[PDB]
Structure formats: structure tokens, C-alpha cells
Amino acid sequence: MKILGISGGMRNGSNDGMCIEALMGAKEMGAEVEFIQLQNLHIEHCTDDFDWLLDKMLDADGIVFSTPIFEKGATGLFHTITDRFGPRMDRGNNIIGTKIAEETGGTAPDPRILKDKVISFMSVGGSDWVTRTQCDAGMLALTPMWKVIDNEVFPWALSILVEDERVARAHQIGRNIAEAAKDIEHAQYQGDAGVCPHCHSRNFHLQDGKAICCLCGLEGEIHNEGGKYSFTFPAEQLEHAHDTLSGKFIHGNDIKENTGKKIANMQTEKYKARQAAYRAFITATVPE
Ligand SMILES: Cc1cc2nc3c(=O)[nH]c(=O)nc-3n(C[C@H](O)[C@H](O)[C@H](O)COP(=O)(O)O)c2cc1C
Ligand SMILES: O=c1cc(-c2ccccc2)oc2cc(O)cc(O)c12
């Protein structure tokens, strides 16, 4: 089993160390290990080394991703890798495209793209402003529905590489990812139960009569039993969650529908006159 470790920190920083630590836990379990340090990569924003990177990820059996915490979440670069995962890694779309190619004499997309895969995350911060990073990390897995084994947060971690019990946890995380990689079918989540009984998220967006899991999308209700919170939802919802084939198919179906309505609207005069007025009213300023 090949475990790929990826770090988004400074070269030779803590995130590198925690990720190599995990890689060592994986080798202890017999895995072959590799390491990518994202500062060596050129990756543009979602409007160039990205493909190479995705290639490396597709060939791994499990991945361990260690990211710094910036403004409570992952770095902008992690969000950019999440952005660029859409067009390439959505499991619903790649299932559709493989079916359609097979049945229309088209060429078979990358088999690899549809292989099951396990992934674990570590978020390393310098304080306790860390309340959005785990959800950030979950999003990356959600597009391709990789199985999250561990999704750990490390606050007050500027000097983490001399905190032995925490470097130990990182080692344990690499043990787990390698073990999960040995049997991806029967591998099971090893992290914190959280509140969402499905996502395991603790991030909810709250409006009157509707609490929504910020990760899996389930709409239900949050309950406070003497300061302990908990999340219920109608079973029917499970059809719609964003990390299920059912939920993705619907989601895409809605995209194709609304993208049709748009293309048509773009030919109306309402659309064309309004756009023409915008072009006339102002011009975008740019640097010299
Ligand atoms: C621009 C910026 C924003 C940051 N925001 C947070 C934050 O919101 N919460 C937190 O714990 N740490 C934050 N940090 C601290 C970084 O996570 C820390 O420098 C990083 O984990 C170091 O890892 P490395 O050694 O691999 O670079 C921030 C750091 C920078 C540079
Ligand atoms: O080492 C840090 C530097 C900065 C930081 C970022 C931009 C400008 C000046 C300092 O912010 C932090 C925020 C945190 O919650 C935890 C940290 O360890 C840091």
C-alpha cells in the first residue's frame, strides 16, 4: 500500500514534520511512502502543477494531508485545490461520464479517477482560532467521496515538534491511514464523533426552523440538552446529502437544468441590453 503525504506549510516547518511523522507511522505498518511539499509546486487559482499533483494522488492508496490554519480554516492554497477538484474529481460526474463514454463509443476516462481511496487530515495552528479548518478539510474529500479516516485539529502548535504526546498522535494517524489503505472497503472512520451523525461535522448554519450541516448538507434540527448539542434530520434527507451518490446526482441534475435556463436567458434582449449597459457604464481598472 502506497501512502502519499502532502504538506501545505513552510519547508521544514511543523506541518512537514507532522506529515513525515505520519508517513513514518505508515511505514511501520508496511506502507510504501512518498512526500510532497506544496511550496515546491506552482498552482494557479481557479479562474499549472495541479495535474501532476492530482496524478500523484490518484496513484496513492491513502493520502495524509497536513495543512496550516489560516483565519480559522485551511490556507487559500487548500481552498484552491478544493476548487480545482470539482471539474476533475466529482464522483457523480465521473460515474456519468464513464457510463456515457462506454455507451457512445467514447474513450474511457481515467479508471483511477473512480477508485475508492482513504484520506486523513491534520490542521496545525498557532492558537485556538481553529473552528473552521476541519470542515474545510472535509470539503476536499467530499467531491470525490474519499473515506476520511482521521481529521485532527492541533491548536497552540507553534512548538508542536517538541510536544511528544502530539507528535505521537501524528504517528498514530499515519498508522491508521496505512491500515485503512490495506482494506479500503472495510476501513472505518477513526476520528471524533462530532455532532452531525452523518458528516461528523460540528459546523452548522442556523436559521429559524432549519439547521444545516456545513459539510454534508443535511437539513434538520439542533438540540441543546443541558449544554450538549445534537443533530436530527428526517431520514428522507439522506437521499440529498452532498457526500452521497444520490445527493450528487440530484445536485448535478439541478446544475444541468439551471445551466440550460441560463444559456437560453443569455439570448434574450433583457439579458443583452442589461449587459450592454454594464459595459457602457464603467471599465475595469488594471495595474500598469
Ligand atoms: C497569515 C496567517 C494566518 C494565520 N491564521 C491562523 C488562525 O487563524 N488560527 C491559528 O491557529 N493559526 C493561524 N496561523 C498560524 C499558522 O498556522 C502557523 O504559522 C503554521 O501552522 C506553521 O506551520 P509550518 O511550520 O508548517 O509553517 C496563521 C498564520 C499565518 C501566516
Ligand atoms: O504565527 C502567527 C502569525 C500570525 C500573523 C499573520 C499575519 C500578520 C502578522 C501575524 O498570526 C497567527 C494567528 C494565530 O491564530 C496563530 C499564530 O501562530 C499566528
Residue numbers in the entry: 1 to 47, 68 to 308
Q: Which statements did the authors publish about this structure?
A:
To further illuminate the underlying mechanism, we solved the complex structures of FLR with various substrates, including apigenin, chrysin, and luteolin that contain similar A/C rings but differ in the B ring. The structures were refined to 2.55, 2.65, and 2.25 Å resolution, respectively, which adopt a very similar conformation with r.m.s.d. value of 0.18~0.21 Å. The substrate and the cofactor FMN bind in the same pocket, which is located at the dimer structure interface and mainly comprised of the N-terminal domain from one molecule and the C-terminal subdomain-2 from the neighbor molecule. The structures clearly demonstrate that the coordination of substrate mainly involves the A/C rings, while the B ring protrudes out of the pocket. Specifically, the A/C rings of substrates stack against the isoalloxazine ring of FMN on one side and the side chain of residue Ile275 of subdomain-2 on the other side. This substrate-binding pattern may explain why FLR can catalyze the reaction of apigenin, chrysin, and luteolin, since all these three substrates differ only in the B ring.
Here, using a combination of bioinformatic, biochemical, and genetic analyses, we discovered and functionally characterized an unreported flavone reductase (FLR) that specifically catalyzes the hydrogenation reaction towards flavones and flavonols, and initiates their metabolism in F. plautii ATCC 49531 as a key step. The underlying molecular mechanism was intensively elucidated by analyzing the crystal structure of FLR as well as the co-crystal structures of FLR and its substrates. Of note, FLR and its widespread homologs represent an unreported class of ene-reductases with highly distinct amino acid sequence and catalytic property compared with those of all known ene-reductases. FLR-like enzymes were abundant in the human gut microbiota as well as other microbes living within flavonoid-rich environments, thereby suggesting a broad role of these ene-reductases in microbial communities.
